[PDB]
Amino acid sequence: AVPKKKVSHQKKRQKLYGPGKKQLKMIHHLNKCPSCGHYKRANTLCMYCVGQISHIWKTHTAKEEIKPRQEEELSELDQRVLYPGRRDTKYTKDLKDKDNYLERRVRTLKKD
Amino acid sequence: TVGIARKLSRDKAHRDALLKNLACQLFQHESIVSTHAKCKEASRVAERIITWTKRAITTSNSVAQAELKSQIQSQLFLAGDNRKLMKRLFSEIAPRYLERPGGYTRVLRLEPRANDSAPQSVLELVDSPVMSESHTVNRGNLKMWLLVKSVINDDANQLPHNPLTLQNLHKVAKFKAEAQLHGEIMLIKQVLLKEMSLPYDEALENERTQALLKEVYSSSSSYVMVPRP
RNA sequence: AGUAUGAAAAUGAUUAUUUUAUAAGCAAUCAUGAAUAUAUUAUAUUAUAUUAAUGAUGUACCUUUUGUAUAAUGGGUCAGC
RNA sequence: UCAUCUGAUUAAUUGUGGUUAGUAGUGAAAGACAAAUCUGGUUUGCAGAUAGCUGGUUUUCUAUGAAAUAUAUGUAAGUA
RNA sequence: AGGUAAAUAAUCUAAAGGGAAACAGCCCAGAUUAAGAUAUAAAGUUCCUAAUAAAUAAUAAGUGAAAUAAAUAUUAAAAU
RNA sequence: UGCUGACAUGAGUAACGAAAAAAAGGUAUAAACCUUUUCACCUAAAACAUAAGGUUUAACUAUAAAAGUACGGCCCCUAAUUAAAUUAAAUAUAAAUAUAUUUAAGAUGGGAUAAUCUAUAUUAAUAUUUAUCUUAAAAUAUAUAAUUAUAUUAUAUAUUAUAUAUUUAUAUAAUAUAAACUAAUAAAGAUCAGGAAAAUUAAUGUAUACCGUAAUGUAGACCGACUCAGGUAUGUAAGUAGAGAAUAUGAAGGUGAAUUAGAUAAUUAAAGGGAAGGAACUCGGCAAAGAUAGCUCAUAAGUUAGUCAAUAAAGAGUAAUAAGAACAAAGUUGUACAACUGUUUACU
RNA sequence: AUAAUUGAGGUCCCGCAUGAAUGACGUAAUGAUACAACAACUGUCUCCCCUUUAAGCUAAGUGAAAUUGAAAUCGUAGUGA
RNA sequence: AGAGUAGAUAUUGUAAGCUAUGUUUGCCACCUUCGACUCAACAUUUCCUCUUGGUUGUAAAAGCUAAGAAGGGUUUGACUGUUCGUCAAUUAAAAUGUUACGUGAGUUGGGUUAAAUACGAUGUGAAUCAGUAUGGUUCCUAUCUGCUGAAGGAAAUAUUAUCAAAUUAAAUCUCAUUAUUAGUACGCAAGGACCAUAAUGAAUCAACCCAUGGUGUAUCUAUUGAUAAUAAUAUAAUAUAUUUAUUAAUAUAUUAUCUAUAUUAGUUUAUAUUUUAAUUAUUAUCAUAGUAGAUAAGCUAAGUUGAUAAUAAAUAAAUAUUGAAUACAUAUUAAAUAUGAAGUUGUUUUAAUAAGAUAAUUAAUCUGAUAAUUUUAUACUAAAAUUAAUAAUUAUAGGUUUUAUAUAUUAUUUAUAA
Ligand SMILES: [Mg+2]
Ligand SMILES: [Mg+2]
Ligand SMILES: [Mg+2]
Ligand SMILES: [Mg+2]
Ligand SMILES: [Mg+2]
Ligand SMILES: [Mg+2]
Ligand SMILES: [Mg+2]
Ligand SMILES: [Mg+2]
Ligand SMILES: [Mg+2]
Ligand SMILES: [Mg+2]
Ligand SMILES: [Mg+2]
Ligand SMILES: [Mg+2]
Ligand SMILES: [Mg+2]
Ligand SMILES: [Mg+2]
Ligand SMILES: [Mg+2]
Ligand SMILES: [Mg+2]
Ligand SMILES: [Mg+2]
Ligand SMILES: [Mg+2]
Ligand SMILES: [Mg+2]
Ligand SMILES: [Mg+2]
Ligand SMILES: [Mg+2]
Ligand SMILES: [Mg+2]
Ligand SMILES: [Mg+2]
Ligand SMILES: [Mg+2]
Ligand SMILES: [Mg+2]
Ligand SMILES: [Mg+2]
Ligand SMILES: [Mg+2]
Ligand SMILES: [Mg+2]
Ligand SMILES: [Mg+2]
Ligand SMILES: [Mg+2]
Ligand SMILES: [Mg+2]
Ligand SMILES: [Mg+2]
Ligand SMILES: [Mg+2]
Ligand SMILES: [Mg+2]
Ligand SMILES: [Mg+2]
Ligand SMILES: [Mg+2]
Ligand SMILES: [Mg+2]
Ligand SMILES: [Mg+2]
Ligand SMILES: [Mg+2]
Ligand SMILES: [Mg+2]
Ligand SMILES: [Mg+2]
Ligand SMILES: [Mg+2]
Ligand SMILES: [Mg+2]
Ligand SMILES: [Mg+2]
Ligand SMILES: [Mg+2]
Ligand SMILES: [Mg+2]
Ligand SMILES: [Mg+2]
Ligand SMILES: [Mg+2]
Ligand SMILES: [Mg+2]
Ligand SMILES: [Mg+2]
Ligand SMILES: [Mg+2]
Ligand SMILES: [Mg+2]
Ligand SMILES: [Mg+2]
Ligand SMILES: [Mg+2]
Ligand SMILES: [Mg+2]
Ligand SMILES: [Mg+2]
Ligand SMILES: [Mg+2]
Ligand SMILES: [Mg+2]
Ligand SMILES: [Mg+2]
Ligand SMILES: [Mg+2]
Ligand SMILES: [Mg+2]
Ligand SMILES: [Mg+2]
Ligand SMILES: [Mg+2]
Ligand SMILES: [Mg+2]
Ligand SMILES: [Mg+2]
Ligand SMILES: [Mg+2]
Ligand SMILES: [Mg+2]
Ligand SMILES: [Mg+2]
Ligand SMILES: [Mg+2]
Ligand SMILES: [Mg+2]
Ligand SMILES: [Mg+2]
Ligand SMILES: [Mg+2]
Ligand SMILES: [Mg+2]
Ligand SMILES: [Mg+2]
Ligand SMILES: [Mg+2]
Ligand SMILES: [Mg+2]
Ligand SMILES: [Mg+2]
Ligand SMILES: [Mg+2]
Ligand SMILES: [Mg+2]
Ligand SMILES: [Mg+2]
Ligand SMILES: [Mg+2]
Ligand SMILES: [Mg+2]
Ligand SMILES: [Mg+2]
Ligand SMILES: [Zn+2]
């Protein structure tokens, strides 16, 4: 149930790093994407090219934003009177700074 | 009960409902991204549904047709955005696949998602129309788009097309009128070139497309095999 | 819980040298090859240093006891007190 | 916690506030409870209580080097 | 009884070193520090393991060869 | 088992706390945030109103809006109770203090008027607990004033038509569902016999103070060291069903979560089914299994006479005959001990 | 009573060491009390099998604990606090 | 000594004698949990099975006693907490121990056990007991050793792909009944064989799923309650087209089936009024998979199939031959020569290892791995299958097609037509 001794430096290290099962393997199965000449996984789509195509689809197949007439044709002063500004909470501010906590996809290296 | 399908870490009732939802979403949006295991199971359902619809369309037996219809109805959630999904299935989706013997979907593997390391895939409908009757482009048929992008890249590099690319193009063609296929390719080029910001001289692009079509369509050792002494 | 400074140790990762995949026990000491490093008197057949070839000897430390390798006490390690 | 079980118009359950406790209350009485546990709480002080008992008591070198017996002891873990 | 109680001697206790396979108390012998030629102690001298050659008898059972198991039985052997 | 600090070991191991998720888009930044659609879960709640509490957690700093009427506090009044207060000498007392009496405080309670909308100031003058039956009345049908059977029976409002003050008032007549529920009324059964305390006319007034108000509240926003399956007061709690607040469903509302994706060995947990047998298991039938109406009938021995036994066991009617939601309902007996309903070691 | 009973009930009385409000005795009712029997039922068992979900296993992210003189931590026999 | 009809030594064996054991009850004081379940390992002082000596007390058959022998096997129930014991029913037999009286970081907790309580006894009493009874508390994610499986690395008498012997590590090894020989041998009769073979079983082990049984959150049908859809039809509105003389008629698309007021306070329902405010087909969700009847694959035992591994060799106790030493005798603790066991060696089976063997040898396609689709396999791994698309041949998974199975209605039918 309980360790009888302080496990030594040797014995913890040979346990962890000695076996190949536990080690990380080289990703030999990279290959060139045909659409953009960059690294991608074998038997896998290029995340750049499919992303680009998804973006294209979004730009074309776009549901139009609903802008109400009455709010679109308000005067500036009138709009300010109706819908004044406010102090956002700390939480709200944190939520707004998305680049702080949201990871955008990185581009791979160009294949040789 | 064991081995017939993926369990997907869900109770039976939930699992089936999930699969139905995935099928509905595939029919609505002609491609969808999801986890690999879910996509694989969803394909099985969607394909089955398509075949049933085809059978209903074709069969002379009225009772059979009614039974197929009932089965199709059972296998979908018809509400909200999928109210007129049955109609779409009979009129829009299933008529694409009348000549095609199975294989109506394609699950294309993606790079696994970063937060979760979950293997990610794209379940999508085969031979989805890239251009509707309105002057727009349609959401779906990712593989075709990728192929055309690869072709464009090859043209830019002034390289020959890869054998695999040609094989894929041939596969795409098999259930496609040649002129229609060409027109689709041309349409894809217009969007793709603009996105990538390469110049679109139209006549030259058309000629290239024609050349690509021609080679696709017109079909043309270490050990020796010797009889026993 | 001042301010500077900090190659103090425990501790982690990495690199170098050296030994190690037929060998068994306080992991040290003594014998003794080999390999490496440094050496403005290596003149060399040289000198020091580092390193579990191989051989021999070797039952942690304290406390408490007639008596403890004891499977009796107490201590995870180092720093300060 | 889940299942199962018991009471469920009564010696019922329960909200809000009040009274009674550290030789000391409350107790359909089990030494039961009195702020995560009482044959009598907690805190502060006497206070460095006391301990014939346990453990600990830190550099080096040099010289000599025991005893575990007798007697006594409310003494046989001690002390002369 | 590795028991208990005292008597005498020794060792251990507080004693390292050699021997007794390993060993608090047995057999030798008392470490001031080295050196390693010579005498050695107890104990050893086929190899493991430092060191050996002989003589005369007996055993044939591996008896025995560093921890001796009895009455009795059988088979011999001497002497009368 | 020294104290403090720092850093190891177990170990990148267990675990990440009852849980249903999917896609598309915000965004070629999302398992976790927002939106839309689908799916599910809670639904006499995981909803909607509130009380208490609390690092304001909120839909936020440009912030929770009150003269009063199905608005609370504050205020007036007092209960339980409290008070270095109160009375040459209230009484007692080593001091502290304690007692009695006064006065003051003290909500958990009582407190005028109001949609016709309503006016609170000042001055002057003399209600334990339970029940709504039976009878009687008239109404509706059958038969031949009287019988039989059935509901109805105190209050709650609009309409129409009359009669009196003069379209505004008062009274009368007639018209008009069922089932729950409310308040207010009346009469009244039982013993356990049911709070306290604070006037009326007239004249003159009344420019209406302060505080509470977010959200959370069967909970991530309180008490539990934690965003803890524990603890936490009250009122509504769509319909369909039913005796019902049981049980099923779920209109609406809310929610789907600081872990995910896969795989589903051994093994564990929590479930479902099981041939032939049926307690052979085991300390022990522990556990599991077992319900042939839940309504209406019917129901024994014994017995303290109490359908106590009884919700008796069996059994019948209605329903169903191959079965086909949940929930209520789980035998009979002998003996020991204790009359019984209760109480007890909060945590063996 | 059971194929078979140290249990149960009935009965006997060398009551080691019963007995009358530390109440004695026999009942009806009650009891989540204790023991025993019958019925019914069954995965309790003969004798386990299949299935379901949550873990377990793998990948990603986060990240405990008791313990620990130091460890280069085998079997047997012998020895020996 | 003495029993044993006679004779101490077939069998029995007083009291006294000499040992072994460490299985009981003690003693010592170095040293501070009984039973059940589960799985067992070891011993032999052998209970059964195999071999054999003796047995006026071996005629036969049952026995009794002794030697070899640990290969295989050695019980299920009633009572009790019990081990034990009593009994019942079996068995070839129901052996005796050791293993911290094996086994609680494997289960249990009935006994023993503290707090509550009562009884009998003891005590003035608090309370007590080699008493009785009811109740009643420990948990642990495994670091090392070890064991069960599974990988990676490695040094290979030097490579890879395959086939692989000796060997090592384990497994296995049986037993009963009936039948025949034979109612023979033997015996007055009663009774009744050895030697040996066969067939049925047994207990154990292994594999398997064709069939049978179970399961089957694949599936299908039935079915109660509530809710929610799609389609069709009707009505209404809007939008888009066509006709007609913005209106009406038609076609397509989308949305809608609400609402409000009455019946004396509130809620619900009902009807009436108001409004365009619909009733058939087919689905789904929830209620343990809602319940029930079937049920494919797989997995399984209740099922099926096979095995209990020979022949051979050397032996144990025991039984002999010739034959001295020792004129006889003596199977030899002499030389020679023979028999002899469920034991030993082996044999058989599994796992490991890889001596050896065949082939190829820097590669337009050498051998492996990474990758994908997977299952023959599986925790992860590993293993195995496939990764075809060109001059030919090769289907891994899904999908498709197919026949087949399941479900449950169906000739009162389906399809072609005249
Ligand atoms: Mg369900
Ligand atoms: Mg299905
Ligand atoms: Mg080596
Ligand atoms: Mg080692
Ligand atoms: Mg140790
Ligand atoms: Mg120690
Ligand atoms: Mg320690
Ligand atoms: Mg009453
Ligand atoms: Mg007591
Ligand atoms: Mg406390
Ligand atoms: Mg207490
Ligand atoms: Mg003092
Ligand atoms: Mg002190
Ligand atoms: Mg003393
Ligand atoms: Mg001296
Ligand atoms: Mg002395
Ligand atoms: Mg003394
Ligand atoms: Mg002694
Ligand atoms: Mg001493
Ligand atoms: Mg010495
Ligand atoms: Mg001395
Ligand atoms: Mg000296
Ligand atoms: Mg010998
Ligand atoms: Mg010896
Ligand atoms: Mg210290
Ligand atoms: Mg671990
Ligand atoms: Mg693990
Ligand atoms: Mg885990
Ligand atoms: Mg997104
Ligand atoms: Mg309910
Ligand atoms: Mg007052
Ligand atoms: Mg109040
Ligand atoms: Mg509030
Ligand atoms: Mg509010
Ligand atoms: Mg709320
Ligand atoms: Mg909570
Ligand atoms: Mg708090
Ligand atoms: Mg806590
Ligand atoms: Mg309801
Ligand atoms: Mg809803
Ligand atoms: Mg809420
Ligand atoms: Mg969670
Ligand atoms: Mg059964
Ligand atoms: Mg049956
Ligand atoms: Mg039993
Ligand atoms: Mg039994
Ligand atoms: Mg039970
Ligand atoms: Mg009667
Ligand atoms: Mg019930
Ligand atoms: Mg009672
Ligand atoms: Mg308790
Ligand atoms: Mg009896
Ligand atoms: Mg019994
Ligand atoms: Mg008397
Ligand atoms: Mg008396
Ligand atoms: Mg009494
Ligand atoms: Mg009671
Ligand atoms: Mg992880
Ligand atoms: Mg020693
Ligand atoms: Mg005689
Ligand atoms: Mg004798
Ligand atoms: Mg002993
Ligand atoms: Mg023997
Ligand atoms: Mg015989
Ligand atoms: Mg054999
Ligand atoms: Mg034991
Ligand atoms: Mg153990
Ligand atoms: Mg242990
Ligand atoms: Mg109990
Ligand atoms: Mg054999
Ligand atoms: Mg089968
Ligand atoms: Mg069958
Ligand atoms: Mg089957
Ligand atoms: Mg009303
Ligand atoms: Mg309508
Ligand atoms: Mg529900
Ligand atoms: Mg002769
Ligand atoms: Mg002879
Ligand atoms: Mg043999
Ligand atoms: Mg290929
Ligand atoms: Mg295939
Ligand atoms: Mg082919
Ligand atoms: Mg296929
Ligand atoms: Zn690319």
- H/E/C letters for each residue in chain A? CCCCCCCCHHHHHHHHHCCCCCCCCCCCCEEECCCCCEEEECCCCCHHHHHHHHHHHHHHCCCCCCCCHHHHCCCHHHHHHHCCCCCCCHHHHHHHCCCCCCCCCCCCCECC
CA distances (Å), B117 to each of A14, B36, B50, B112, B113, in order?
A: 27, 12, 32, 5, 5
Tell whether A61 lies on the interface with B, counting CB pairs under 8 A: yes
Q: What's the reported resolution, in angstroms, to a tenth?
A: 3.8
Beta bridge partners of B33: B122
Q: Which of strand G's nucleotides are less than 7 A from any protein C-beta?
A: 50-55, 59-60, 66-73
Tokens of A26: 């080289």
Both tokens assigned to B94? 């299933």
* Beta-bridge partners for B32: B123
Please check whether residue A47 is in contact with residue B114, taking contact to mean a CB–CB distance below 8 angstroms. Answer: no
The answer to whether A100 contacts chain B (CB < 8 Å) is: no
Alpha-carbon distance B182 to nearest alpha carbon in chain A (angstroms) = 19
Residues annotated in a binding site of A? 33, 36, 46, 49
Which 8-state DSSP code applies to residue B95?
G
Round to whole Å and give the CA distance between B68 and B75: 11
Distance, Å, B2 CA → F329 C1': 40
- Nearest-CA neighbor of B30 among B125, B94, B137? B125
Report yes or no: A111 and A46 within 8 Å, Cβ to Cβ: no
CA distances from B19 to A9, B42, B44, B143, B220 (A): 51, 5, 9, 23, 44
State the virtual CA torsion across B72, B76, B78, B82 in degrees, nearest 10.
-110
Q: What is the DSSP letter of B31?
A: E
Residue type, B14: H
Cβ pair A38, A110 in contact under 8 A: yes
Give the tokens for residue B168: 């894929």
Q: How many CB atoms lie within 10 A of CB A108?
A: 17
Q: B120 CA, F174 C1': separation in Å?
A: 82
Contacts 24+ apart (CB under 8 A), A60-63: A60/B136, A60/B137, A60/B139, A60/B191, A61/B136, A61/B137, A61/B138, A61/B139
Which one of B121, B142, B158 would you mutate to disrupt binding with A, by most A Cβ within 10 Å of its Cβ?
Answer: B142
Residue B192 sits at the chain A interface (C-beta within 8 Å): yes
Decide: helix, strand or coil at residue B125: strand
The rounded Å distance from CA B69 to ligand 62 centre is 88
* Least Cα separation, residue B207 to chain A (angstroms): 20
User: What span, in angstroms and rounded, lies between the C-alpha atoms of A59 and A65?
Assistant: 13
Q: Is B187 on the interface with A (CB under 8 A)?
A: no
Place of tokens 């195509």: A53
- From chain B, the residues in CB contact with A36 under 8 A are 149, 153
User: In B84-179, where do the E strands start and end?
Assistant: 105-109, 120-125
As a whole number of angstroms, the distance between CA B85 and CA B78 comes to 7
A79 CB within 8 Å of a chain B CB: no
Measured CA to C1', the nucleotide nearest A14 is H153
A10 CA, E34 C1': separation in Å?
A: 41
Spatial CA neighbour of B145 closest among A45, A78, A79: A45
* Chain A residues within 8 A of B108 when measuring between CB atoms: 45
Contacts of A82 (CB under 8 A, 6+ apart): A74
Q: Are B155 and B143 in contact (CB under 8 A)?
A: no
Q: What is the dihedral of CA A76, A81, A86, A92, to 10 degrees?
A: -60
Tokens representing B1 are: 């009960």
Comparing CA positions, the residue from B35, B58, B52, B174 lying closest to residue B113 is: B35
Query: Considering only CB atoms, which chain A residues are within 8 Å of B32?
Result: none
CA–CA distance, B165 with B155 (Å, rounded to integer):
13
Separation in Å: G67 C1' and A23 CA: 28
Report which DSSP code applies to B90.
I
Show residues of chain B in contact with A102, CB under 8 Å. none
A41 min Cα distance to partner chain B (Å): 7
State how far the Cα of A98 lies from the Cα of B150, in Å rounded to an integer: 34
Give the distance (Å) from ligand 13 centre to CA of residue B88: 91
Separation of alpha carbons B40 and B121, rounded Å? 9
